[PDB]
Amino acid sequence: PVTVAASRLGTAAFDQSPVELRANYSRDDAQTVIRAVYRQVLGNDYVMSSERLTAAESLFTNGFISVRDFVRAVAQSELYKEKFLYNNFQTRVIELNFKHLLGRAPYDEAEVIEHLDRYQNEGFEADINSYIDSAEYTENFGDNIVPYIRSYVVQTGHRTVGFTRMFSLQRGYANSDRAQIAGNASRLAQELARNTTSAVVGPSGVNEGWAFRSAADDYHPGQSLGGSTGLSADDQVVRVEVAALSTPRYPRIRRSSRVFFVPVSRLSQKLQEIQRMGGRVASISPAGQ
Amino acid sequence: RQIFFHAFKCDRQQLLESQLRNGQITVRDFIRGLLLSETFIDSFYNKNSNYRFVEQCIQRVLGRDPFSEQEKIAWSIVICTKGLAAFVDQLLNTDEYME
Amino acid sequence: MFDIFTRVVSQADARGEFISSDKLEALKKVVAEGTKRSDAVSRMTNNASSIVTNAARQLFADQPQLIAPGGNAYTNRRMAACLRDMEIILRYVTYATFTGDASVLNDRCLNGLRETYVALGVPGASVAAGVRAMGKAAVAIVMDPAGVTSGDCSSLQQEIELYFETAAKAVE
Amino acid sequence: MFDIFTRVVSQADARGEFISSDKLEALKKVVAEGTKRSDAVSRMTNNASSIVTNAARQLFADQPQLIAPGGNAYTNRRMAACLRDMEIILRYVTYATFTGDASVLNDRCLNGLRETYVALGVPGASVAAGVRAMGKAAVAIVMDPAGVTSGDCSSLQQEIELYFETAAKAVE
Amino acid sequence: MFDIFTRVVSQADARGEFISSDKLEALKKVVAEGTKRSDAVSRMTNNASSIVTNAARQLFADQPQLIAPGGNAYTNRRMAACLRDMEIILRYVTYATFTGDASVLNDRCLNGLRETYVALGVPGASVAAGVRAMGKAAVAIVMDPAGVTSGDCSSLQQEIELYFETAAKAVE
Amino acid sequence: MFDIFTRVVSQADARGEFISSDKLEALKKVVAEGTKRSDAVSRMTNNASSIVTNAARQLFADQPQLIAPGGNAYTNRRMAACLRDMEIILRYVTYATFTGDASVLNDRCLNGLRETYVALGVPGASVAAGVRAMGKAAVAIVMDPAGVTSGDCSSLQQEIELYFETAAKAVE
Amino acid sequence: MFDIFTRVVSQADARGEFISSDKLEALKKVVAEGTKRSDAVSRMTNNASSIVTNAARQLFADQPQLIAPGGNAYTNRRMAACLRDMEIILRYVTYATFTGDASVLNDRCLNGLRETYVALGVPGASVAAGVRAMGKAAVAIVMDPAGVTSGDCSSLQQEIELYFETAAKAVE
Amino acid sequence: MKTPLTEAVALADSQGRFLSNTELQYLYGRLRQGAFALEAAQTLTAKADTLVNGAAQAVYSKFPYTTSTPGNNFAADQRGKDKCARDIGYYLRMVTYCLVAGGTGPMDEYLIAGVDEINRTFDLSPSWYVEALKHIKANHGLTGDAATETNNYIDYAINALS
Amino acid sequence: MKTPLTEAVALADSQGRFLSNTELQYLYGRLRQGAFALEAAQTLTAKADTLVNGAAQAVYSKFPYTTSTPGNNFAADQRGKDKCARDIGYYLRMVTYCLVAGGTGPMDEYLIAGVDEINRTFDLSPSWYVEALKHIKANHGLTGDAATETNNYIDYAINALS
């Protein structure tokens, strides 16, 4: 659990405990649980009062429908498919289902293989049921508990890849899931089929380097093969990712955000020259040596 | 061709080109790797005089002739006081090359 | 997620020593003016719907391109979402001036909403001007005193205008 | 950076065999209609400044928020950069329909400029609509024949609208 | 890279109107106290080497693990780099209180030095405590009057302590 | 997620032929020494809590900045998380030397935890030194013979030190 | 989930009229003794772990069949679950005497836990005797005056013994 | 039912812990509130009937069309006036209930939770109720901190209306 | 960080509503608490060093075996005494931090959340810390309601220990 950097990772927004529905909940408590379910399943997208699905929603407040089954009902509703399935690629649909219904990002490509086959065989409804009716789901939170993201915790079953992929899936409390920087393109699948994760980036008023993205052409490993063979220095290599190179104009810079492998001995000069360009350093990570 | 008129097959550096095709190495770092290369030092730095070498390398890297002999005299001190590596580092990060 | 007191506690723990005396006199004066901070906060809170409606009222009088078809706040659904975004910003301003720290306002809005408005195509300039006008109207509503015992609320105007300018600059 | 011919050559080399006959008949028909493509391209090229000025003319009539102060294309320098961005996109469209392959348009613009417009705060929606309107005006300018021998520009209209939609979708 | 005046100009341009009168009275009072700001800056600037040496002197008395072998500031080269990092931070503080805006301090060191100290293995806590002690000594050196007419420098102490706390929190 | 046998199977399938004879003699010698690999693995496993406590014991004697307030492992919760991180690394080392392949250690820790420690602000150097000291103590605990028939375990110390150095270098 | 005040509000709403005067004098006396109710609640809360350990200490001295092998609380896991069940019951007693209503204690434990102990095979008699002994020790710990101003807390002995007997009878 | 003691118990229950000093701070604060709030609720109980009639007359004064046009939603006939002063008294009774309970819970459960769809289905303008609540908060005649928190509850009802 | 204003904001945020009179009741209660609690925290800051040494001596008195047996967990050598009076001062500093913050949040985040596994891994008996906290809560020398809530925080630490 990530406390010291919670300010800059946005975890301190989500530090609060999971909501629990009780045996005999009060009338008002069901509406609060409904608000949390609507937020997490629809990824902070706001629901208008006309689209509230009050017919299935009232059965929850009666107690006919368990909170897990309420999550299933809102996942298989039509407005969900319009928000999430329809305008997205199916690996992106699979990643969003893993984020909403379990909390964690998918770990490997073999995880995507099963759900992708299941969609084509049986439909999205059975696919959603297989997300929700999993041993992983039932173990990590109960049916009464609204699903939450569980990545900062090891929780005895997380790989390390899940924590770094979760930050690509979630960008702050204010951010709305339909509306992100990547847009329609799945962030995790290019990382996932090569089984390589990128250094994570925070959001803005925390850190202005968000603007950086890993473009489709150039894939950078984050590991310098030379250990400064190319850089021809004996010092150690870092990896510096800059988000917005504004001051050189069109003929001078073709891309506003790129990465550079810099030795430590000439790192300060690189920071100065890059800062004079109006560039914003998203993250500096150790690369080699 | 720009750094040392013709490059023989022994002259070429498999490390520098090999790093260049990935994207780990930028082309100015390839220029530095050609400048601090031993065959460039042997052909250019050992045979020429110090002031003549400063003239030649300023011509090649900056793309411009040196303004006067006084400029080459001014730059020639960095080479011996700090080494050719620090001189190449001071020559590549000027305003003119970066602009 | 920090108070004033938790901010002094975290700073004193990072120092590793006990809290110095001058910080305790500062916190005593804060405890004396904390009610002063918040009675006004209460008069800020009670008029919140009038504040957001007057702010959108002046903003859409000022920039009629948003109401114009093809504008970002043109559609009825989008216009309701716009009023929702403004009301959320005002609510987190009231939370930050309740706890006396800008870290709650940072935590809950700022780091993500700039990228959200970029990705949505939302013009950050109009909502920045709207938060500025809402903050000006909020201090103007707070400063006036009607049927309330007089007190020096001047220190707060500084802090409230700080919170509103932080929100407007983090929006951009 | 690929032609049509280099595309068939790379595919035949990845197959590892010689070029099959049906691909050669396809390339013969391509060589017969390549001038057809060339003629269409030249009448697209000659009116390029009118195309980008009319496209920005309709776009800034359509979205006056960009011209409004605080808008992304408000400043004179930024507005000149906006017209430069549009002219660059049109030029690489003309290059791709010259070589008959979208790989030049991909190589030169697409993979980076989406992230560039995200990082700059540029709204991708307006420039997407502008590239769409510019492409509609470009096919409308190409399809009319004035003092030109009759020819079928229709095969090209498919390809040119493909290139423009690829540019508009890669922008987003 | 902003002044106070350029900050008001950018805000008035984002509003799109002329500068209001109350902002001009605020800027007139700023022009009256800008020399006042400045006098404090010059007596801060003249003692800078004493400030950084006393700050490192108290810091390495306080945390002897950095001087201990294997410590981050143990090596002579690394210790010189540490004093260089501290002097750079003090210089950009003096620049920000010269221009009267924290945007220069943000621009120059704040955006990329937290990640730099993470990647280097530099403990952010010690340099945060060192910037805090340096700022405390800087206000303590500024507030005493030597050859200066009595005047109100209270506003400046607020601003200088703001800049130092912004630096110490952006370091973390 | 690979064995030794599944590694040879995947390599032979990528070759597309049957398994060659010399690989089968190598796997026969592996089946002869696989128990040799793992009796030691058992003596590595039985002392795991002593290994991680002695490793943290020497590490926090070595770097007292982590125990110092403001340090990364200072807080009781964070210190428990630190011992948890170390125990996890030791457990996956024991898994990799159980299956005889480093691919399980790669799969479960390595690719993500470097970025995790960067994002957390965790110093990678201290945990790298701790994994190195833990590995040195692990081979030192494994190599001594107490109540065990003499055998040639030369392959095992090489392989275990390989796994520990892979973990320490992937941490960085 | 009801207070005292919400209980009077729900009763007055079911009557459909306003609250009568005598209920308001009763609630005024409740507001006068509500602190009296809860200072004791605080002295009940501070000794909770001692209360549950002494209660299990006397209970397992009293019924050694539960500690005996084959007993219901024999296994270490089951014995920890037993102490957890007792601590939960004490916590909800403290909640009910905080809010001044037994409806929270009913809501959170009573209706289900009798059937739970039947289905588990848990003897309801032993846990009933344990809740009775815990309640006797709780009133005995609450009633003694140690450095506290003399108070009337006896009626509140009435209420606390009522809550404990309700818990013990709903357990059965 | 958002009342302070209830929500303190809900916090301590959802956290899974015992009560701490935080809830006792909540409690001495709640008793401080109730020590004036109960007497203020009794004073509102005394002045209730005249306040209801004055609010109804002010609502008929500001919106004179409702007395004139034929329509079962409008109070032109007498049954409209009976039902409509009945819901004036409903609003005032919910104000007194929140004054006793110490939180906005009773109005949130008895009034607010469905008022929007009811005014949508029945063609009732909420501005009528806003005018009535404004007249009540002007004419309740309390003083001091009880008056400020009474105005707080009425302003909360106004903001929940529109 | 369970402090009253933070948890009030968390309640109002999870409910999705504005602040009500409930949070203002929480606030006048919190200010009532802090109005003595800050001065009590300053008084504990004054008496801190002698309280730490007295707690360490009482812990050595009740458990004399820890001074005698060789073991790196025991304070037989001098480094054990330095580290162990260091964690005495840690406990006292967390008590003062919770006195300033007004809730059990700082001790819950800095001490309690991992103390059980740490004492499990390091062979530290928690009864040593219980004895030290009992000596502190006996010898802090405060009076009145500040003394009662100080004893509340120390008893909370004791119940969290064992």
Ligand SMILES: CCC1=C(C)/C(=C/C2=NC(=C\c3[nH]c(/C=C4\NC(=O)[C@H](C)[C@H]4CC)c(C)c3CCC(=O)O)/C(CCC(=O)O)=C2C)NC1=O
């Ligand atoms: C299965 C593979 C796996 C790994 C490797 C893993 C690492 C991991 N270590 C973490 C924290 C941590 N890891 C450390 C460890 C250290 N920091 C130091 O100061 C020392 C250099 C080092 C002790 C060796 C510490 C102190 C934290 C706590 C950070 C915090 O809670 O703020 C976190 C943040 C969430 C949390 O612990 O509760 C993750 C995800 N998680 C995994 O699931």
Ligand SMILES: CCC1=C(C)/C(=C/C2=NC(=C\c3[nH]c(/C=C4\NC(=O)[C@H](C)[C@H]4CC)c(C)c3CCC(=O)O)/C(CCC(=O)O)=C2C)NC1=O
């Ligand atoms: C808790 C913090 C938080 C913030 C700040 C937040 C903002 C936010 N505003 C959004 C939309 C919006 N926000 C606006 C607001 C505006 N656009 C304009 O034209 C004006 C410049 C401005 C009015 C001030 C509009 C119009 C939309 C609708 C976009 C759409 O639905 O397509 C969305 C997309 C999802 C949705 O509303 O339903 C998010 C996530 N969400 C959060 O959870």
Ligand SMILES: CCC1=C(C)/C(=C/C2=NC(=C\c3[nH]c(/C=C4\NC(=O)[C@H](C)[C@H]4CC)c(C)c3CCC(=O)O)/C(CCC(=O)O)=C2C)NC1=O
């Ligand atoms: C060869 C391929 C290539 C592309 C595509 C490219 C785009 C590009 N457009 C830029 C700026 C820009 N691009 C735009 C364009 C627009 N913004 C809007 O408001 C409209 C939605 C749209 C007009 C269609 C504007 C206004 C800027 C200026 C941003 C600034 O200067 O702050 C910049 C920042 C540096 C600079 O212009 O001088 C780059 C790198 N550069 C390239 O080298």
Ligand SMILES: CCC1=C(C)/C(=C/C2=NC(=C\c3[nH]c(/C=C4\NC(=O)[C@H](C)[C@H]4CC)c(C)c3CCC(=O)O)/C(CCC(=O)O)=C2C)NC1=O
């Ligand atoms: C939540 C319900 C509630 C309210 C509303 C409340 C308000 C409130 N405001 C007070 C004081 C005060 N309130 C003000 C406020 C102001 N004076 C000015 O001249 C300014 C224009 C204005 C601020 C903008 C002042 C100056 C005082 C003086 C006493 C103090 O510092 O608290 C006090 C002190 C105690 C008392 O008056 O009996 C109360 C009760 N207390 C409550 O329990």
Ligand SMILES: CCC1=C(C)/C(=C/C2=NC(=C\c3[nH]c(/C=C4\NC(=O)[C@H](C)[C@H]4CC)c(C)c3CCC(=O)O)/C(CCC(=O)O)=C2C)NC1=O
């Ligand atoms: C680089 C300088 C250059 C140009 C510009 C050029 C154009 C050119 N276009 C031609 C034909 C033609 N060009 C067109 C083009 C079209 N007809 C339509 O109705 C369509 C709307 C339009 C395409 C969109 C057609 C239909 C022909 C008929 C002859 C042919 O197939 O080439 C020919 C055949 C030979 C001739 O006309 O003398 C020439 C010369 N040749 C050159 O050397």
Ligand SMILES: CCC1=C(C)/C(=C/C2=NC(=C\c3[nH]c(/C=C4\NC(=O)[C@H](C)[C@H]4CC)c(C)c3CCC(=O)O)/C(CCC(=O)O)=C2C)NC1=O
């Ligand atoms: C213009 C803005 C700017 C900043 C802020 C900056 C920081 C900076 N500090 C660095 C190193 C350093 N910075 C420190 C400073 C410290 N470490 C400690 O132990 C203490 C906690 C602290 C003393 C206050 C040290 C010791 C190094 C040396 C690391 C090394 O050489 O391995 C480096 C690595 C390259 C090098 O110094 O020569 C950079 C880039 N550079 C810049 O260009």
Ligand SMILES: CCC1=C(C)/C(=C/C2=NC(=C\c3[nH]c(/C=C4\NC(=O)[C@H](C)[C@H]4CC)c(C)c3CCC(=O)O)/C(CCC(=O)O)=C2C)NC1=O
């Ligand atoms: C670079 C050469 C230079 C100096 C040194 C300089 C100083 C300087 N300080 C001034 C004012 C002042 N300077 C101070 C400074 C202080 N008063 C206190 O009691 C504080 C302890 C202390 C700040 C810590 C004050 C209070 C004033 C009043 C007038 C003003 O606001 O400028 C003025 C106003 C004009 C005048 O005095 O004739 C001058 C000239 N001007 C110059 O051109």
Ligand SMILES: CCC1=C(C)/C(=C/C2=NC(=C\c3[nH]c(/C=C4\NC(=O)[C@H](C)[C@H]4CC)c(C)c3CCC(=O)O)/C(CCC(=O)O)=C2C)NC1=O
């Ligand atoms: C899980 C319970 C379990 C254990 C513990 C176990 C150990 C074990 N170790 C064995 C062999 C052995 N174990 C060792 C180990 C070593 N010799 C050295 O000199 C080195 C220092 C050291 C390794 C570091 C050797 C050399 C042998 C020889 C036989 C063989 O290759 O298995 C064998 C072979 C069969 C036998 O001894 O009866 C057993 C049973 N078997 C079990 O079922």
Ligand SMILES: CCC1=C(C)/C(=C/C2=NC(=C\c3[nH]c(/C=C4\NC(=O)[C@H](C)[C@H]4CC)c(C)c3CCC(=O)O)/C(CCC(=O)O)=C2C)NC1=O
């Ligand atoms: C043995 C049976 C018995 C009990 C239980 C008892 C308690 C008791 N606590 C009282 C007061 C009090 N009790 C507290 C206690 C606290 N307030 C807080 O906010 C803190 C969290 C907490 C201490 C940790 C306070 C603040 C008072 C105020 C009055 C006074 O100083 O006595 C009083 C004063 C007289 C009265 O309330 O009628 C009584 C009776 N008296 C008895 O005869």
Ligand SMILES: CCC1=C(C)/C(=C/C2=NC(=C\c3[nH]c(/C=C4\NC(=O)[C@H](C)[C@H]4CC)c(C)c3CCC(=O)O)/C(CCC(=O)O)=C2C)NC1=O
């Ligand atoms: C306890 C909280 C509570 C409220 C607020 C409440 C309002 C309420 N007012 C209603 C009707 C009404 N409401 C009004 C009120 C007015 N019309 C006017 O012209 C006047 C401006 C205003 C007088 C205050 C009238 C006249 C009706 C009867 C109209 C009808 O058939 O629906 C109805 C429909 C029931 C019916 O048709 O008789 C409800 C549920 N009910 C409740 O249980």
Ligand SMILES: CCC1=C(C)/C(=C/C2=NC(=C\c3[nH]c(/C=C4\NC(=O)[C@H](C)[C@H]4CC)c(C)c3CCC(=O)O)/C(CCC(=O)O)=C2C)NC1=O
């Ligand atoms: C801020 C909250 C906080 C607490 C409570 C804390 C406790 C703490 N005490 C520790 C060790 C220790 N704790 C003790 C304490 C004692 N042993 C005795 O015999 C005495 C009875 C008692 C003296 C009070 C000693 C002697 C050590 C060093 C033993 C060790 O190697 O692990 C350690 C392991 C670190 C190390 O090995 O140096 C932690 C994390 N750390 C924290 O950050």
